[PDB]
Design a protein around this ligand. Structure first.
Ligand code: L9F
Ligand code: L9F
Lengths: 304, 304
């Protein structure tokens, strides 16, 4: 028993982190096979970031200008290219610690682990969710660029995120491993506001099922609701509308606990309308939305 | 910017996890050099756990009865011994992935990362605090026994915890790597209640400094207090008494923010007496106490 914001073991990703320097800018790179992936803003200087022309900037750069260091040993760069907002530096050596991997573009509401890195070195690991507004509420400082988000299925690492920037609001923006930004963000030092951030309803419901499994049942009530009634409440409280797909994914949690999805929706409805009244749920005084139904099942069954 | 419950990168610890089986019981072991460390209750059966005589039970066991598997390869056991509540199985091969390591007995209020494991395989990593009552509020299921807690100083892993049991209250008890339990707990299937759990005051203050650093300042007020005035409040709210040692460790955070420790104490005093009034601090609706002043400095400076 017990419920924690758990990250995947980071070992397979630590063995891929390298340091990439170009000119006087240093950030993190991801070494998979004979390719190093990093944010293309490594070629920029502070003057360039106001309105950079990445194509023109990359033209003034050769393979020898990109310094890639893996631990204390230098990698030899034999090719370079720009794919959307990432640079792919072809090195002459395949990473011997390359795990089985995939590049995946996650959906908003999905979760992943982040291995925060500075100068190609890992400092910490934490669990995150891609917000519905495509930002992440992470923990990143200057130099953390190139840090990656991922999921692990037994031996396969699915890389889903690469950190690029922090918005003036303190939230984080980044790309998938093909260099495509999540959301409307551009890699430019310009004011970019994130949209309204909604609460991931299916995840809050999954976390309420995790709470029931682990003994916290005070919030269960004698009521039920319908998807349309529940969604009237969800809209008022800036919660994502619940669909039958969301109900379907909550099925294993509903089967294990014996609490019908719509009944759990009625508990959530009353929590939204009445608050917690000073009480806690799984050690939290607010409704947690960064656990998917898959995360709950995995943690409550011990998937390794 | 941003503040997360960050765990250390788990790679160095993943390379030490093995599976230990004795009879029909399987749990996790920690392979460092030519020794495998695991909870001594691996020699027990369900009948034995009511009141086990570990010395008599271990006498019926030989080196060949302990099956140690590292990944898919078997380790050959050449020695076995009991040190307090751990078994030390001498294997004929040193772990090639043994990191630089130490065994340390942490103090209550100190934090550490846990690499939860099942059948010698890692499933997840999370940050924990040793509660003042010597329990941990972890996330562990049957089979997680032998999972370890640790800290990392650059390349050195300081192992501080080994998971042994879950109390009927759903909280966790375990030992240091010499087999000594944290707290009054015994490795026996008997009702053992934990003492009163207090809030780690120095950690809540460190987290309030982290909040100020990251922009959350609504809780700052025009008041100050004294250690004795503050402690009258701390006692009423089951907070640990604040000492000059605690004030001393908060010094770097006080210097960085320019908010005197006693002034931050006055903010905490008002938060304890008035609540949050529906507001949040670093995305939390309660006072977080599982970040030490060292954790705050490290995360806010990017120590790798
Ligand atoms: O180089 C950096 N570092 C900053 C940083 C600070 C904290 C967390 N993460 C990143 C940042 O935002 N930029 C950036 C500035 C402008 C455009 C781009 Cl792509 C990136
Ligand atoms: O073998 C187990 N597994 C249980 C478990 C369940 C969930 C989390 N952690 C451990 C447990 O508590 N015991 C135990 C039972 C009695 C004495 C001892 Cl040392 C240990």
């Amino acid at each position: 028993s017990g419920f924690r914001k758990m990250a995947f073991p980071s070992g397979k990703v630590e063995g891929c982190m390298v340091q990439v320097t170009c000119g006087t800018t240093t950030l993190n790179g991801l070494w998979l096979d004979d390719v190093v992936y990093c944010p293309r803003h490594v070629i920029c200087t502070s003057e360039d970031m106001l309105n950079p022309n990445y194509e023109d900037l990359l033209i003034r750069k050769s393979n020898h200008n990109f310094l890639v260091q893996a631990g204390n040993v230098q990698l030899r760069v034999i090719g370079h290219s720009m794919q959307n907002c990432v640079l792919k530096l072809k090195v002459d050596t395949a990473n011997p610690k390359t795990p089985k991997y995939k590049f995946v573009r996650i959906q908003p509401g999905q979760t992943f682990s982040v291995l925060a890195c500075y100068n190609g070195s890992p400092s910490g690991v934490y669990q995150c969710a891609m917000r519905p507004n495509f930002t992440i509420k992470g923990s990143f400082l200057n130099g953390s660029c190139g840090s990656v988000g991922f999921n692990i299925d037994y031996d396969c690492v699915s890389f889903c995120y690469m950190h690029h920037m922090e918005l003036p609001t303190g939230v984080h923006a980044g790309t998938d491993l093909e260099g495509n930004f999540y959301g409307p963000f551009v890699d430019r030092q310009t004011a970019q506001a994130a949209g309204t951030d909604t609460t991931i309803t299916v995840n809050v419901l999954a976390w309420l099922y995790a709470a029931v499994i682990n003994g916290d049942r005070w919030f269960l009530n004698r009521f039920t609701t319908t998807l349309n009634d529940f969604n009237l409440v969800a809209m008022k409280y800036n919660y994502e509308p619940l669909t039958q797909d969301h109900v379907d994914i909550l099925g294993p949690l509903s089967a294990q606990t014996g609490i019908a999805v719509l009944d759990m929706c009625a508990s959530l409805k009353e929590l939204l309308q009445n608050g917690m009244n000073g009480r806690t749920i799984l050690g939290s005084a607010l409704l947690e939305d960064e656990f998917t139904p898959f995360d709950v099942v995995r943690q409550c069954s011990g998937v390794t």
